[PDB]
Paper text:
We incubated [name] with TBZ prior to vitrification, and obtained a 3.37 Å resolution VMAT2T map. A rod-like density in the central translocation funnel permits good fitting of a TBZ molecule, which was also supported by the overall stable molecular dynamics (MD) simulation trajectories. In our structure, VMAT2T adopts an occluded state, displaying concerted movements in the luminal halves of TM1, TM2, TM7, TM8 and TM10 compared with VMAT2A. Remarkably, beyond a rigid body rocking between the N- and C-domain, a unique transformation of helix-to-loop occurred at TM2 and TM7. Specifically, the last three helical turns (Residues 313–323) of TM7 unwound at Pro313 and stretched into an unstructured loop (LuL7–8), swinging towards TM1 and TM2 of the N-domain to block the luminal exit. Similarly, the luminal three helical turns of TM2 (Residues 124–132) unraveled from a hinge residue, Gly132, and ran along the newly exposed electronegative cleft after TM7’s relocation. This rearrangement latched the C-domain by buckling Leu124/Leu125 side-chains into a hydrophobic cavity occupied by TM7 apical residues Leu315 and Trp318. TBZ is situated just below the central plane of the translocation funnel. Its high binding affinity (60 nM) to [name] corresponds to its occupation within an enlarged hydrophobic/electronegative pocket formed by TM1, TM2, TM4, TM5, TM7, TM8, TM10, and TM11. Mutational substitutions including Y341A, F429A, Y433A, I308A and I395A, had varying impacts on TBZ’s binding and inhibition activity against [name]. This robust non-polar network positions the sole tertiary amine of TBZ close to the negatively charged Glu312 on TM7. In the TBZ-bound [name] structure, the carbonyl oxygen is oriented towards Asn34 on TM1.
Numbering used by the authors: 18 to 48, 123 to 474
């Protein structure tokens, strides 16, 4: 049934973000409050840029041959990424494995969201199922850091990666049992061209909303006071703890608020999420140390869950209303906007760091978010 596809997408994004985020206890092994590292900048941005580039081709590919085959391709390349990643002694091998993992993340996310939207035609529980998928993303990024840390500090370096690989194999067994991509299943009608879809005001407004929210995240994580040379208290706790607040708030907000955002007015959800994101990003620089950095994360993650659960079903619904019922290209647009923030995070952050200080960057990012928030009013009554 439909819930089975929902579970497939849930666990696919769960394992995807688990593999994405389990790296954090391992990044220290390779070599005022907020500072950037050029070594982690390429590590943080190579996956994002590769996945950025790889998105629209996969959208067209799902439009061409079907949904399950790209998901199984995501299985194959994520498994080979884990295999080449556990043994990745060198930094170049690490970057190449991250790029392969990015291709896998692109196909998994785009195809899963597209088929989840296609099977769930009506918008009443469409928001619910996209909220559940994003909750799977949040749960994966929540369980990543501490699982990786305990497996690294109790067994060894390769043990978390091998255990995650076994979990991926169980996932792929489930995929083969469920989707069965035995034959190519072409779509009934040709989809709306990607270039024509970018000539749309509302789609671009939603894409900019998601891009600015994820940029609000992405300008902070590579610059967190983590993964230095050494620590007085040996650190090793912040590595597994620092992503608890944002992930917990994302999970809670998305899961509890998708249905109520459908009820109350989803443009209102977008606007409130943008306002709270701006407030949180603007109040990050007013923190003396990492002691006070925990509080604004609970707000920024909550509001970015708001934005994601309030714009991904709109990405589906705008094309459902004003275009043909083909979702691959529009969800490729949604995800390319979703990841452009992470892709341009390190370079833009470093340039603006060389120019001015970080607190001014946080204030200007919050100002842009606040000024862009009223533009979500245009989505109340789309023709
Ligand atoms: C290794 O660098 C990464 C670090 C982190 C993430 C992804 C990364 O890979 C680029 C995820 C992914 C997201 O989407 C964000 C979740 C927010 C919105 C709660 C941020 N988290 C947490 C930290």
């Amino acid at each position: 049934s439909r819930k089975l596809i929902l579970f497939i997408v849930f666990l696919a994004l769960l394992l995807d973000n688990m593999l994405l985020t389990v790296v954090v206890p391992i990044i220290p092994s390779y070599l005022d409050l907020l500072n950037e590292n050029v070594q982690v900048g390429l590590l943080f941005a190579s996956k994002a840029t590769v996945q950025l580039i790889t998105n629209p081709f996969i959208g067209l590919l799902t439009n061409r041959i079907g949904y399950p085959i790209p998901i199984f391709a995501g299985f194959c390349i994520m498994f080979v990424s884990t295999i080449m990643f556990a043994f990745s002694s060198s930094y170049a091998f690490l970057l190449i494995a991250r790029s392969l993992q990015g291709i896998g993340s692109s196909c998994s996310s785009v195809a899963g969201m597209g088929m989840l939207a296609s099977v769930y035609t009506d918008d009443e529980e469409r928001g619910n199922v996209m909220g559940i998928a994003l909750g799977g993303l949040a749960m994966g990024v929540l369980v990543g850091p501490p699982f990786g840390s305990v497996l690294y500090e109790f067994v060894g370096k390769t043990a978390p990666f091998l255990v995650l690989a076994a979990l991926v194999l169980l996932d792929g067994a489930i995929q083969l049992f469920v989707l069965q991509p035995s034959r190519v299943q072409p779509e009934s009608q040709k989809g709306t061209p990607l270039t024509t879809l970018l000539k749309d005001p509302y789609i671009l407004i939603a894409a900019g909303s998601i891009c600015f929210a994820n940029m609000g995240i992405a300008m902070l994580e590579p610059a967190l006071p983590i993964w230095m040379m050494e620590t007085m208290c040996s650190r090793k706790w912040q590595l597994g703890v620092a992503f608890l607040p944002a992930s917990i708030s994302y999970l809670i907000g998305t899961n509890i608020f998708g249905i109520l955002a459908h009820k109350m007015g989803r443009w209102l959800c977008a606007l409130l999420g943008m306002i709270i994101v701006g407030v949180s990003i603007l109040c990050i620089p007013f923190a003396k140390n990492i002691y006070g950095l925990i509080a604004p994360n609970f707000g920024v993650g909550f509001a970015i869950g708001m934005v994601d659960s309030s714009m991904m079903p709109i990405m589906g619904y705008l094309v459902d209303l004003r275009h043909v019922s083909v979702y691959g290209s529009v969800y490729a647009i949604a995800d390319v906007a979703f990841c452009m923030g992470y892709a341009i995070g390190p370079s833009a952050g470093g340039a603006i760091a060389k120019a001015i200080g970080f607190p001014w960057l946080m204030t200007i990012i919050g100002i842009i978010d606040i000024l862009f928030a009223p533009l979500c009013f245009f989505l109340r009554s789309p023709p």
